[PDB]
Amino acid sequence: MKLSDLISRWIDVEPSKNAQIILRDRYFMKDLDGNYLETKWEDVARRVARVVATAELLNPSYKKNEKLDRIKEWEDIFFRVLKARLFIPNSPTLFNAGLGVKHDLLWKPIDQMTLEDYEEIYRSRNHLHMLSACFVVPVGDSIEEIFEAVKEYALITKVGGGVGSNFSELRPKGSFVAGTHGKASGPVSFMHVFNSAISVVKQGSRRRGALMGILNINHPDIEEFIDAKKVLNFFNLSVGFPMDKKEILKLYEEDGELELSHPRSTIRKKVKIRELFRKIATNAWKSGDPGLAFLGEMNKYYPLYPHRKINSTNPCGEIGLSDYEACNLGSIDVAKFYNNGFVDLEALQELVQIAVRFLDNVIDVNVFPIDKITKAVKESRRLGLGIMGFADLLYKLEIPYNSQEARDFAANLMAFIALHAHRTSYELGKEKGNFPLLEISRYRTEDNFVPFAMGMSNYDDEIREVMKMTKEFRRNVALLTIAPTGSISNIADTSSGLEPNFLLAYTRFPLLYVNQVLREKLNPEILKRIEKELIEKGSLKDIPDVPEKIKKVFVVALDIDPMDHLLMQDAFQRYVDNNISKTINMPQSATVDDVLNVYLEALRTNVRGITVYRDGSL
Amino acid sequence: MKLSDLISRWIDVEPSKNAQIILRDRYFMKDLDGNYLETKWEDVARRVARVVATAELLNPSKLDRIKEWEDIFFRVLKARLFIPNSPTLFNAGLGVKHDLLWKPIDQMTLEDYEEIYRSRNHLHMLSACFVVPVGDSIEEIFEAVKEYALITKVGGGVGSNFSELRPKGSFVAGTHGKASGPVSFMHVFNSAISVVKQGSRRGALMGILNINHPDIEEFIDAKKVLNFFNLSVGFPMDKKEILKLYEEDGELELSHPRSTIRKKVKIRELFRKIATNAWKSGDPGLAFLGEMNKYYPLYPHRKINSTNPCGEIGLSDYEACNLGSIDVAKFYNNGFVDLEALQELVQIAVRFLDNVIDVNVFPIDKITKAVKESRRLGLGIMGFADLLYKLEIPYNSQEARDFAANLMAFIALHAHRTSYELGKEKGNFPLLEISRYRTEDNFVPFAMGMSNYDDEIREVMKMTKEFRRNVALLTIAPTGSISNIADTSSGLEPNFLLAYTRFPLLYVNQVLREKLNPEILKRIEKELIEKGSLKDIPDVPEKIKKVFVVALDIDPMDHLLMQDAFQRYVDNNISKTINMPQSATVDDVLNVYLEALRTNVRGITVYRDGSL
Ligand code: B12
Ligand code: B12
Ligand SMILES: Cc1cn([C@H]2C[C@H](O)[C@@H](COP(=O)(O)OP(=O)(O)OP(=O)(O)O)O2)c(=O)[nH]c1=O
Ligand SMILES: Cc1cn([C@H]2C[C@H](O)[C@@H](COP(=O)(O)OP(=O)(O)OP(=O)(O)O)O2)c(=O)[nH]c1=O
Ligand SMILES: Nc1nc2c(ncn2[C@@H]2O[C@H](COP(=O)(O)OP(=O)(O)O)[C@@H](O)[C@H]2O)c(=O)[nH]1
Ligand SMILES: Nc1nc2c(ncn2[C@@H]2O[C@H](COP(=O)(O)OP(=O)(O)O)[C@@H](O)[C@H]2O)c(=O)[nH]1
Ligand SMILES: C[C@H]1O[C@@H](n2cnc3c(N)ncnc32)[C@H](O)[C@@H]1O
Ligand SMILES: C[C@H]1O[C@@H](n2cnc3c(N)ncnc32)[C@H](O)[C@@H]1O
Ligand SMILES: [Mg+2]
Ligand SMILES: [Mg+2]
């Protein structure tokens, strides 16, 4: 069906009470006095649609004598899609769109807008008008560069972004410092200063996982890094693997040794790569940290490598970024695309096109806190279009999350989105101009470059064809990711990202959720009966008088074994040009050897990173 | 006896084994390979002398002249008559080719000196102490954090007043949130220095919060963490007003311009809070900022907000100070202070310090500007208590305090005189014209009132209206390290002990050795070392007991008044610890604070014996 008619099915479905609570708390805009300027999700949709549509002022293919009509049409489409909650951008977009703008412009009826209204909106965006989820900054091996980075952590966090850094440039603890004949404190000690800095800045104010800290596997302090949180409470930590995944797996299988060294230290040491891995798995087994960041694999698919290089991800790992780049994210709720036993691909393709344009327009009205960021964003125009609602979609389709059927369905779904997002990038590049670095990227300098592995869909040949087309026109260096969508999946009343539902029924602080699809497919008699058990046990698995058919479809995270989590991640990653946020859930009974096996399997698959969490470990 | 003869009696006197340990530890220059470039104290005087005499290149009033100054610098340095703050000893010559810094002087060409001047690197930081502003924004706060790290890297201390930071809980418009407050941000500064060192840092920082800041009470209790900070309470108002409010049992309004947070508190209760904390742990101190500006020649165009970590210098934003001290114990001669020799060395010292500026490389450009615009110097003394010993003058006496004020007045006179000459010879400091030396008749940068020297000083300040090289010239620093180098007592402080064991070689005060009969010392020593004093020890000549007093023999008020005597003739501030007996109460501490408001002291630090 047409997207316009799908919109009609959803646009007047009101957010749940839980959703409305979240909206009131953090998203509805207020004046300096704490009075609400917005009271309904509708208000947010109008404000955000209007600010992002304003980007069309800059569109060189519109004559001035048509800009108003064209801008208005885009506000209209952005508004309807947002109000329907078919696509929602990353939280900072919702928070900060319209900061600096006269309040009598942000919500006025669209039929009353003038060209001058849109220009006033565009001109009055203030320095807090920061619409991206996160960033990566370099940390150079000097007191000067380190405290400059600390300053940037502070500035970025203030306006609401998260930040990642690879700290491997910092020379090992005890290395010679020529200026003082002294000893270097090493990356880990310095990370404590970054943590301390963030402790006094809020947005505010819950800042859990606001930072990413990576140290490479061959750094002389890697063993200390691995043991760091066992404070650094605002960091997520990952071990960086800049070499090819194949080379590290071969080294493990051969029981080889890794040379730990640094180009500005005499500190050198050899460690058994198996012992190192076991130390990593042992810590992950206990606490869930550190994760693994396959940087080499990110660079294999980075269209600007080696001119530019990915050294770090953002805090939740889903985007590998070069220095001073940002996360520009937004997600489609694919559960709203279910139609009588299938996914409405006609409506989905239209929304993919609209969503790419929306995210790309966000760049134009984004205001960054640092000059170098503005430059790096404009030069590559990297986007992060993702999905949520995936687990709920499978519930509707009656497909077990832990099945090859689901993984085949995922790869094909994702290949379809990638195809149409990249085709849109081509179109936008023809319309508005290519990303300035296109001419030096592998889309132009190389034959048959494709920014992901593929190999699991009937769309591959069509994808190859479009990638060839983008040699000539391309708006964006990359377009896709799958984010946690922790807050925005709640606003959308759907399951988060690509993850299975963690629980079918639970109480949060104090109303109880019950999965909506479960309510529609399970006999209302049986439900009222088993609701008690379900909440206590956290699964349908071992409940009598529950049809085997629904037990199979309605699996939760811990019903699904780790390899099925990992293989789902691989199925998606084959058709994503950035990365993916995915927790590999493991049962309490899991061993350190079990964790090692996940790592080894990960190395053979196409994933670009790994996070595991053992139930009960924390 | 004239400076030349005095140098002859000292120039060939080697540093003690004790002092030699300090020098081989961290003063002798090494390769990046770790090898010794310098092995004896004289090798140090050669480098430093030659580098500072390079400044004469800039002298608009030329190879014979530079060499001249290097010689006189060298001789006074080698004889340990005068010594610059440690960073000058550490960092002089950094970046300069080793073939230039030591080779025989008669082998020096003009080519050579110009090369030294050109090749001074970014580590060539020759000053002890800095002050930097911390503005009320995340941007300014973290720019200041970076500044702390950069200054600490090159070997400097740094101080700030954190009063501009709005109080904990205040509104932040940019986030609609709540401010963390000054004390929370100070923790970030502390963490920063935690990972930075010039070789390995106690009291590297000064943190001041003003008495009327709404978080003043949290700040007073801040340390009970911030291990690299010394803390002081700031009094930007006149000492008179606070004494008044205290005597009237008045109330102080706590407020901040960027907060709606405000509060009334009894001023006596705030003082008692301070005293109790000080009584427990020696912090925080009092900084009478208003009194510093009172004598600040550039007030209010520029304004003193903070001191360095030891408090002896009141600095406006981004200023530094290069200190150097004269060992007065070496000027003892036949029951007199050799005013002839001492005078020559003062002129030389002022020139030396003023030259250090020209060859100094600062880590930040706003600092280079501040230093070059005012040319503030900090010339001081060490060996004072040992001088009293030689003069057989009890430290805790009116004779001591009168002698002290006279010594200092004398130094003050000749220092400000030489600043007139150098101002004539090299040009005035750029802000002369807007300073009170020109804009008001009868401005004097200290209180005086304790010497017959005052009248001439009043005249020399007047001639200063036309020619003056430096905005102010004098300080008394702790001289912790340089006094041990000079084998003498530190700063203006009485000796803390007459006998202690350096490991297992014993030491007894070099001068006590001469006045006392060796036979008595052999017996006495045992008890002296356990009691840390001679006042109760049986069969010690009364005149010996009263002359060779140590810090704890001298009561709180006599320490304070000694600080007053010196301060009347110091245009900057003074480092002085007011020691108190272990049996002191919080009330005794309060009385010291109240007395200090009545004297001319610009700051106060107290330490109760055995509190830590
Ligand atoms: C998004 C997210 C995050 C983000 C949240 C910020 C963001 N970028 O959106 C960040 C990066 C903070 C994060 C971190 C971690 N998370 Co998480 N996270 C999620 C996720 C996907 C959504 C949560 C959410 O926003 N819900 C909606 C909001 C509106 O409700 P909320 O009540 O305000 O949510 C808050 C809490 O969930 C909290 N939180 C997030 N993760 C965790 C983990 C633990 C152990 C705790 C106590 C709290 C907590 O942060 C939220 C506010 O930002 C859920 C999965 C799920 N089923 O919900 C997990 C989930 C709670 N996380 C989990 C885990 C294990 C972790 C980590 C231990 C992973 C790691 N590598 O270390 C860390 C813990 C860090 C710490 N200091 O404790 C598990 C915990 C399982 C369990 N049995 O408790 C979950 C269920 C994912 C999973 N599939 O297992 N997470
Ligand atoms: C200079 C100095 C300082 C400097 C040292 C660096 C510098 N500016 O060069 C600073 C600012 C760090 C300082 C601080 C304090 N000091 Co102090 N300091 C001195 C002084 C004048 C010189 C000693 C020295 O360096 N000797 C030569 C060097 C080469 O040998 P050293 O053994 O390596 O010296 C080190 C120790 O003395 C140490 N140190 C300095 N002060 C203190 C205080 C205590 C309690 C301890 C354990 C160590 C210590 O720092 C030196 C190296 O930098 C002496 C007075 C004296 N007559 O010696 C005191 C002295 C040791 N300090 C004293 C006191 C009380 C303090 C403070 C508590 C005061 C305060 N306001 O907080 C603090 C303690 C801070 C802390 N973290 O413990 C008293 C201690 C009395 C006692 N019963 O032990 C002394 C004896 C001075 C006095 N007038 O009473 N001090
Ligand atoms: C100066 C200094 C550096 N470091 C660390 C921070 C950086 O990781 C690293 C380099 O610091 P730098 O600031 O580059 O020190 P430097 O330039 O004087 O010395 P070099 O020529 O050897 O670079 O050493 C400390 O841990 N403590 C210190 O005091
Ligand atoms: C942003 C932020 C500021 N602050 C403090 C730092 C400064 O002391 C003070 C000002 O911060 P600023 O960074 O200057 O805040 P702002 O400009 O966005 O808001 P305003 O106009 O109200 O100044 O608040 C916090 O404590 N936490 C924070 O998260
Ligand atoms: N500073 C900060 N950044 C965050 C936080 N949560 C998320 N981010 C950024 O947003 C990314 C993904 O969060 P996600 O759950 O998908 O976004 P959401 O649904 O808008 O909350 C993280 O990797 C960070 O880059 C936070 O609590 N603090
Ligand atoms: N960073 C730093 N600064 C210091 C240190 N010791 C002294 N200073 C600075 O020098 C001033 C007094 O030092 P002083 O002991 O008189 O000089 P020294 O004998 O040469 O070490 C203090 O106010 C500080 O500003 C130190 O250990 N670290
Ligand atoms: C629960 C959420 O926490 C994020 N998360 C936590 N730690 C890491 C990490 N080290 N690397 C990548 N993502 C992480 C996951 O991406 C997941 O979505
Ligand atoms: C031992 C040395 O410590 C310095 N010192 C320690 N703390 C302070 C302070 N808070 N204010 C001024 N000086 C201080 C004293 O000036 C003394 O000279
Ligand atoms: Mg460097
Ligand atoms: Mg501000």
Is-contact A28 A38, C-beta < 8 A?
A: yes
Quickly list DSSP for A57-96: GG-TTS-TTTHHHHHHHHHHHHHHHHHTTSEEE-HHHHHH
First to last CA, chain A: 47
Which ranges in A470-590 belong to alpha helices (H)? 488-491, 516-521, 524-537, 548-553, 562-573
Strand partners, B254: B263
Residue where the block lists tokens 């801008």: A71
Backbone φ and ψ for B45, nearest 5 degrees, come out as -65, -30
Q: How far apart are CA B304 and CA B310, in angstroms?
A: 15
Q: Which residue, A467, A457, A474, is CA-closest to A415?
A: A457
Query: How many Cβ atoms are within 10 Å of A255's Cβ, its own excluded?
Result: 10
DSSP state of A482: B
CB atoms within 10 A of CB A67: 17
Q: H/E element holding A198?
A: helix A186-198
The CA distance from A172 to A327, in Å, is: 30
**In the structure encoding, which two tokens stand for residue A225, read together?**
């890094």
Instruction: Give the 3-state secondary structure of residue B252.
Output: strand
Ligand 7 neighbourhood includes A236 CB (under 6 angstroms):
yes
Cα–Cα separations (whole angstroms), residue A29 to A34, A116, B173, B435, B517: 9, 24, 13, 52, 87
Residue A486 and residue A563: Cα distance in Å, rounded?
A: 23
Amino acid at B135: G
In angstroms, the CA B459 to CA B257 distance is 43
- Residue closest by Cα to atom 23 of ligand 5: A316
Q: Where are the alpha helices (DSSP H) in B53-178?
A: 63-78, 86-91, 98-101, 110-118, 138-154
How far, in Å, CA of A83 to CA of A15, rounded?
10
CB-based contact (8 Å) between B177 and chain A? yes
Which helix (H) or strand (E) segment holds residue A269: the answer is strand A269-272
Extract the tokens encoding A544.
């009598």
**Quick check: helix, strand or coil at residue A530?**
helix
Query: If we measure between CA atoms, which residue out of B357, B510, B380 comes closest to residue B18?
Result: B510
Contact A195, A231 (CB under 8 A): yes
**Could you identify the residue written with the tokens 């690197």?**
B121
Runs of H (alpha helix) within A470-513: 488-491
Question: CA–CA separation, A121 vs A100, rounded Å?
Answer: 9
Residue A468 carries which DSSP code?
H
What HEC string does B574-586 produce? Answer: ECCEEEECCCCCH
Q: Which of A176, A179, A196 sits opposite B187 (nearest CB)?
A: A196
Q: Which of B191, B193, B198, B200 to mutate to test binding with chain A, by most A CBs within 10 Å of its CB?
A: B191
Give φ, ψ of A164 to 5 degrees: -120, 150
B312 annotated active-site: yes
What tokens were used for A511?
Answer: 């109303």
Q: Find the A162 Cα to ligand 5 centroid distance in Å.
A: 7
User: A534: burial class by Cβ within 10 Å (0-12, 13-18, 19+)?
Assistant: buried
Closest to B95 measured CA to CA, from B69, B135, B125, B74: B125
Cβ pair A580, A607 in contact under 8 A? yes
Distance between CA B493 and CA B491 in Å, rounded?
A: 6
Residue with tokens 């004559």: A63
Which DSSP string do the residues of A134-178 spell out, in sequence order? EEE----SSHHHHHHHHHHHHHHHHHT-EEEEE-TTSPPTT-EET
Whether the CB-CB separation of A415 and A453 falls below 8 Å is answered with no
Q: Do A155 and B138 touch (CB under 8 A)?
A: yes
Provide the phi-psi class of B22: left if phi over 0, else alpha when psi is between -120 and 50, else beta. Answer: alpha
Query: What region does B488 belong to: left with phi over 0, alpha with psi -120 to 50, or beta?
Result: beta
CA-based nearest residue to A397, from A459, A485, A337, A333: A337
Residue whose entry in the numeric block shows the structure tokens 């196409």: A606
Spell out the domain ranges in chain B: 1-612
A212 in helix, strand or coil? Answer: strand
Locate tokens 């006279």: which residue? B406
Q: How many CB atoms lie within 10 A of CB B40?
A: 16
Give a three-class secondary structure readout of B406-429: HHHHHHHHHHHHHHHHHHHHHCCC
Give A321's contacts (C-beta < 8 A, 6+ positions apart).
Answer: A135, A136, A164, A310, A312, A313, A314, A327, A382
CA separation (Å) from A313 to A165, A321, A477, A573, B336? Answer: 7, 6, 16, 15, 74
Report d(CA B206, CA B183) in Å as an integer: 13
d(CA B539, CA B526): 14
- Give Cα separations from B64 to A217, A332, A586, A592, B69 (angstroms): 61, 82, 83, 78, 9
Whether the CB-CB separation of A195 and A149 falls below 8 Å is answered with: no
Q: Tell me, what DSSP letter sits at residue B328?
A: G
The pairing of strands B577-580 and B603-608 is parallel
Please determine, looking at this structure, whether the domain spanning B1-612 carries the CATH number 3.30.420.10: no
Dist. CA B181–CA A448, nearest whole Å: 57
Q: Which tokens go with B309? A: 């970590």
* Euclidean distance between CA atoms B167 and B254, whole angstroms: 10
Task: In whole angstroms, give the CA distance from residue B552 to residue A291.
Answer: 60
Q: b or e along B155-191 (b: 16 or more beta carbons within 10 Å of the residue's beta carbon)?
A: bbbbbbbbbbbbbbbbbbeebebebbbbbebbbbbbb
DSSP B45-69: HHHHHHHHGGGGGG----HHHHHHH
Binding-face residues of A in 26-55 toward B, CB within 8 A? 30, 32, 34
Resolution in A: 1.9
Of A190, A193, A481, whose CA–CA distance to A321 is shortest? A481
CA distance A432 to A473: 10
Integer angstrom CA distances of residue A18 from A23, A208, A493, A527, B32? 9, 21, 9, 21, 64
Cβ atoms within 10 A of the Cβ of B234, count? 26
Residue in B419, B477, B400, B408 with CA at minimum distance from that of residue B446? B408
A196 touching chain B per CB within 8 A: yes
Strand partners, A258: A271
E strands within A160-261? 162-166, 176-177, 182-183, 211-216, 235-240, 257-260
A1-618 folds as Anaerobic Ribonucleotide-triphosphate Reductase Large Chain (3.20.70)
Burial (CB count <10 Å: 0-12, 13-18, 19+), residue B197:
middle
Please give the Cα distance from B555 to B491 (Å, whole number): 18
Token pair in block for residue B149: 């790290």
Which bound ligand lies closest to the C-alpha atom of B135?
Answer: 4
Contacts of A196 in chain B (CB under 8 A): 187-188, 191
CA-CA distances (angstroms) from residue A275 to A270, A280, A595, B462? 11, 9, 14, 79
Question: Is the Cα torsion angle B501, B506, B511, B513 positive or negative in sign?
Answer: positive
State the catalytic residues of A.
Answer: 314, 316, 318
How far is it, in rounded angstroms, from Cα A200 to Cα A202? 7
User: Phi, psi (5° rounding) for residue B307?
Assistant: -110, 170
Interface of A with B in 69-128 (CB under 8 A): 128
Q: What are residue A87's DSSP bridge partners? A: A332
Answer whether B546's CB lies under 8 Å from B395's CB.
no
- At A323, is the secondary structure helix, strand, or coil? coil
- Biggest distance spanned by C-alpha atoms of chain A: 77
Q: What does the CA dihedral A596, A601, A607, A609 come to, rounded to 10 degrees?
A: 10
Contact A358, A87 (CB under 8 A): yes
Q: Give the phi and the psi of residue B474 in degrees, each rounded to 5.
A: -125, 140
Query: What is the spatial distance between Cα A318 and Cα A312, in angstroms, rounded to a whole number?
Result: 10
User: Among candidates B292, B322, B324, which has minimal Cα distance to B306?
Assistant: B292
How are beta strands B157-161 and B129-131 bridged, if at all?
Answer: parallel
In 3D space, the residue among B5, B103, B94 whose CA is nearest the CA of residue B46 turns out to be B103
Ligand 2 centroid to Cα of residue B492, in Å, is: 14
Cα separation, A562 vs A583, whole angstroms: 9
- Which among B30, B34, B184 has CB closest to A200? B184
Pick from A596, A592, A605, A534: nearest CA to A564: A605
The beta strand positions in A336-448, using DSSP E, are: 338-339, 342-343, 384-388
Q: In what order do the strands lie in the sheet with A583-586?
A: A326-327, A134-136, A162-166, A211-216, A235-240, A291-293, A609-614, A583-586
The answer to whether the Cα torsion of B97, B98, B102, B105 is positive or negative is: negative
Element (H, E) at B398: helix B398-426
Cα separation, A309 vs A288, in Å, equals 28
